[PDB]
Design a protein around this ligand. Structure first.
Ligand SMILES: Cc1cn([C@H]2C[C@H](O)[C@@H](COP(=O)(O)OP(=O)(O)O)O2)c(=O)[nH]c1=O
Ligand SMILES: Cc1cn([C@H]2C[C@H](O)[C@@H](COP(=O)(O)OP(=O)(O)O)O2)c(=O)[nH]c1=O
Ligand SMILES: [Mg+2]
Ligand SMILES: [Mg+2]
Lengths: 208, 208
């Protein structure tokens, strides 16, 4: 079973992945996890992050260039994802294809039924062959709270300074809205919308 | 021995690669060839070409995004290039790293001592580990003649319509100028500047 955890920056995805993995293991299922971007394992991922931190000229100014880099990162992980799914009962991803649809649409002020989301579908699922997730869990959080979390992280960790997207409050808001739309239409597969107070035990029961 | 053939669009590079390979083989040396972009073998290469033909939103509008895609294409060919060099006496490339420096600098109206060329050096040779060529041969041709060749190709081949770069006469001119500068400074290694009337036999003798 392939599960992807989605949400804006500072929504609490990493923590949910930890809690969910614990819940699945408590139920006797083997679990494997993978997070995108795969910094260090993909040149595309590293360049993307660096661009969001002010490097690489005009790269970050292009919505499709950034989306392409994240897609190329996932493209290189197809084998890994396929291998993990045939080796573990559950594979949980911290961000997946929907992140690209949500952020790209939001940067262009488009909705989930727009051009960017459709492009992501065509490129990542059809062309690159990335498997569609059995479940996509949207960790919906107030834009204000998520932004506060991102800022707090930068304050206590010199290695966690915010990037161009995280510093854009309006972008984060629009991204949360597109995510809600993607979930409602079942973009890429079935979705579940949860809050910061979701019970890991029952969530795992719903997914497993 | 690693040799890269460089020059603007329609300079006659493909033909020179053929003639040069023939000359080397006539001298008893084994020869292998590779052309960049590696269309069909790299998702990055294909997306780059498609972007230059009007697809993928705002991707082509970013100079660094395009350069990154071509660099990612070559990155995936490192093993191949290394394998070919230890298996053949001569390895000839139709375009290599210098193409990225020349076109990127030209799109930004920079010279060979500019920011873009230095970025290409840092990213492709140092970071990605691409081997520096023993020789880089610049097939210098009049901007007018090269442009005429590109146009003629599109006229007789429906599968060879010109792209965004080829349609930009001024860009092609500036690119030729940056190439001349790169050769004069020995950017990335030793260069040889030849014309359309260069003798394949003697050129091979100089290189081999
Ligand atoms: C994985 C992914 C991330 N992004 C965005 C969301 C984030 O702002 C940013 C990087 O992802 P994120 O997981 O936030 O990484 P970091 O720890 O570096 O903050 O890029 C996309 O636009 N598309 C994608 O496919
Ligand atoms: C290989 C390469 C090409 N280019 C440019 C030169 C050409 O205009 C274009 C594509 O290369 P080209 O060899 O002309 O391919 P095609 O047969 O599709 O015309 O992109 C770069 O800017 N950087 C690179 O590294
Ligand atoms: Mg982030
Ligand atoms: Mg061309």
């Amino acid at each position: 079973m392939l599960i992807a955890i989605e949400g804006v920056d500072g929504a609490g995805k990493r923590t949910l992945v930890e809690k969910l993995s614990g819940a699945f293991r408590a139920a006797g299922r083997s679990v494997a996890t993978l997070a995108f971007p795969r910094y260090g394992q993909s040149v595309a991922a590293d360049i993307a992050a660096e661009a969001l931190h002010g490097e690489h000229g005009d790269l970050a100014s292009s919505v499709y260039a950034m989306a392409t880099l994240f897609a190329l990162d996932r493209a290189g992980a197809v084998h890994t994802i396929q291998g993990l799914c045939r080796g573990y009962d559950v594979v949980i991803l911290d961000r997946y294809v929907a992140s690209n649809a949500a952020y790209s649409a939001a940067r262009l002020h488009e909705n989930a039924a727009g051009k960017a989301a459709a492009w992501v579908q065509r490129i990542e699922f059809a062309r690159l062959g990335l498997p569609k997730p059995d479940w996509q869990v949207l960790l919906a959080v107030s834009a204000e709270l998520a932004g506060e979390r991102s800022r707090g992280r930068a304050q206590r960790d010199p290695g966690r300074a915010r990037d161009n997207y995280e510093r854009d409050a309006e972008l984060q808001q629009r991204t949360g809205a597109v995510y809600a739309e993607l979930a409602a239409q079942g973009w890429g597969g079935r979705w579940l919308v949860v809050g910061a107070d979701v019970d890991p035990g029952r969530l795992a029961a719903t997914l497993a």
